[PDB]
Every structure is written in structure tokens, then in C-alpha cells.
Design a protein around this ligand. Structure first.
Ligand SMILES: [Ca+2]
Length: 354
């Protein structure tokens, strides 16, 4: 006989069980909406692949494997201001936005002689209008149309900055599939300056010749094109593809607008109308240190291109004054597409005393 104890426990716990139910039910309603969006995008993508629609080229046309090059080493031409290792150390514990606050660095933090080994990530300031050329070798995992890739060259040119010094701070990864993390102070009010970088990638075969991409099999990612709108900015990340060709990702917030691809509306906060939240461990934009997306919903912030070997330009701007502008821009063969969301969420069981 435990009737009294059991009755009193069930009665005492009921308010908490009801509060947990309300939270679980709200979460279920939110999850159903996310599931329906993911399912629609996945079904559309499957149809595009099966029927041979344009976006099916992500699967059907891909001949480029260029996703992971953790052994690559760098040779850099055209950089005149490398960040000293002492200055890198001094800024390493700061918030990311402060690490890229160019107001917090002075001339004594930079040197003309590169202190970084070829095998490690390298830091430097870029100067508007000065093209740099980065050659990456020790390429072990990559190929294009069954031509193993021996080397990659990427040229980068800073066209504009958000600061008033014509400069931006860069962390250049030794693995070229991680590309570049760039930022600067946002020195002016008015949301109208931007960091703009033109890039061009050349792949080389085992005999050292440049690889012709005109079979149109190099499908490259343009993921993580955030657009957030808050009291602190109308921050938009964009790509001008130049002579390369846009590949629309089904269900993505990113589309073609004249000359550029980006998300026309906020894609970062459900509170601002986005379908998925971008922030946090569970957000669509979550990434590992390797740059790999953590989220099956990464497609929501992504575009892609058929890369034809010609220059393209990424931009980021719209922050308010004094909030440093940053972007981790990567491009590689790992296009973010909708994935199978699994089974539809089921509602929580309502707690009862009966
Ligand atoms: Ca981004």
C-alpha cells in the first residue's frame, strides 16, 4: 500500500509537469514548422536531381573534389604587413569582433617580413587595391574530373573596407578549402561601407599545368551568406559571381538580385521572419573549427556556383558604426543542400492525473 505517497507525489508534481508540457508543446509547434520547411526543400531537391533540373547539377555535374586539405602549405606574394606573432598572441583571447577591430592595432603590430611558417595559418593586413597571390601545395585529397590536383593558386584583392584606413585584417588558413577570415572596424555611421574582396582560384594538375574548367563540372559552395537586421546593423553578405554561374539551392534564403547573390531579407532570426535561427550550437550557421557545417539546415543560408575559372567578389557590410565587420568566406566543393529531416515531430503527451 503506497496510495497516499503516490497520490501526494502526483499532486505535488503536477504544476511542474504542466509547465514542462507547455514548453514542450511550444517546441513541437516550432519544430513542425521547421520540419515542413526542410521537408519541402528536400523533396524539391530530390525532384531537381531526378528530373535533371538546373539545381540538380550539384549532384549530377560535380567533378570537383576540393573539401579537406589539412596538410597544405602556403607561399604568399604581395603582402607587406604581416601581423607579428606577439600581436596575434595579445589579441587571441579577445572576442572575435574585438580581434578584428582594426582600431586596436598599431603599426608596431605589423612587420614586412613574414614570421609565419608555410605550414600554419597566417595573419596579415590587406591594403585596398593591392592584389596578393597565395600558392597552396601539399594537396593530397583533391581532384577535378579525375585529374588529381597538385597545387592551388588563389589571388585576393581588397576593393574596399569598412574602416577609414583602406585596410582589413586577415587570417589566411593554410588549408585553401577554408579560404579567409577577414574583418575591420566599422568606422562610419550610415551602413553603407563594405569589405569587398575579389578572388580567383586556379587548380593545377600533377604536371603543373592549369586545369581547364570549361566542362562546367566545378560546382563550388557559397554558403553562410548571412543577412541579419538588428539595432546594431543591417548586415548583408553578398557574392558577385562575375562570369561564373549561379546554382540556386532549393529552399534557400539566397537568390540572384541583379548582379549579386544574397538573402534579400533577414535569414538569421525567426523573430525577424527567418525560417530557422542562425545563431547557437543548433543554428543553421553553426560551424566547426574545420569550417564544416554542423547543421542539416545549412542550405538555408547558402548558394552555389558553377565555377568557370573567372574572378568573383564577396562583400559584407551594413553594420552600425563601432561594431566591427567580419566574414569567414570559404568556398570549396561541399555545397550545402537540403537533407532528409527524418520523421515529422510528434506532439508531447499531455500530463494527466486521471
Ligand atoms: Ca557567413
Amino acid at each position: 500500500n503506497t496510495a497516499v505517497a503516490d497520490y501526494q507525489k502526483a499532486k505535488a508534481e503536477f504544476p511542474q509537469k504542466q509547465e514542462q508540457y507547455n514548453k514542450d508543446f511550444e517546441k513541437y509547434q516550432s519544430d513542425v514548422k521547421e520540419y515542413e520547411a526542410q521537408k519541402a526543400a528536400y523533396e524539391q531537391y530530390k525532384k531537381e536531381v531526378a528530373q535533371g533540373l538546373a539545381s540538380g547539377r550539384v549532384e549530377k555535374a560535380q567533378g570537383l573534389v576540393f573539401i579537406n586539405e589539412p596538410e597544405a602549405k602556403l607561399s604568399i606574394e604581395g603582402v607587406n604587413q604581416y601581423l607579428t606573432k606577439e600581436a596575434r598572441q595579445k589579441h587571441a583571447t579577445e572576442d572575435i569582433l574585438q580581434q578584428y577591430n582594426t582600431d586596436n592595432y598599431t603599426a608596431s603590430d605589423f612587420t614586412q617580413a613574414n614570421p609565419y611558417d608555410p605550414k600554419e595559418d597566417t595573419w596579415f593586413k590587406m591594403k585596398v587595391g593591392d592584389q596578393i597571390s597565395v600558392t597552396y601545395d601539399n594537396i593530397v585529397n583533391s581532384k577535378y574530373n579525375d585529374k588529381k590536383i597538385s597545387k592551388v593558386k588563389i589571388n585576393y584583392t581588397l576593393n574596399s573596407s569598412t574602416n577609414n584606413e583602406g585596410s582589413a585584417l586577415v587570417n589566411l588558413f593554410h588549408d585553401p578549402t577554408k579560404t579567409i577570415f577577414i574583418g575591420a572596424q566599422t568606422s562610419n555611421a550610415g551602413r553603407n561601407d563594405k569589405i569587398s574582396v575579389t578572388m580567383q582560384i586556379i587548380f593545377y594538375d600533377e604536371n603543373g599545368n592549369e586545369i581547364d574548367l570549361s566542362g562546367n563540372n566545378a560546382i563550388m559552395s557559397l554558403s553562410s551568406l548571412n543577412h541579419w537586421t538588428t539595432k546594431y546593423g543591417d548586415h548583408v553578405e553578398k557574392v558577385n559571381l562575375g562570369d561564373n554561374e549561379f546554382v540556386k539551392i532549393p529552399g534557400s534564403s539566397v537568390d540572384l538580385h541583379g548582379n549579386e547573390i544574397y538573402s534579400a531579407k533577414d535569414n538569421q532570426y525567426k523573430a525577424n521572419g527567418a525560417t530557422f535561427n542562425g545563431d547557437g550550437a543548433d543554428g543553421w550557421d553553426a560551424v566547426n573549427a574545420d569550417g564544416t557545417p554542423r547543421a542539416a539546415t545549412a542550405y538555408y543560408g547558402a548558394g552555389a556556383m558553377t565555377y568557370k575559372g573567372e574572378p568573383f567578389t564577396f562583400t559584407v557590410g551594413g553594420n552600425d558604426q563601432n561594431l566591427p565587420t567580419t566574414i569567414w568566406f570559404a568556398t570549396n566543393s561541399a555545397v550545402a543542400v537540403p537533407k532528409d529531416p527524418g520523421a515529422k515531430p510528434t506532439p508531447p503527451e499531455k500530463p494527466e492525473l486521471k
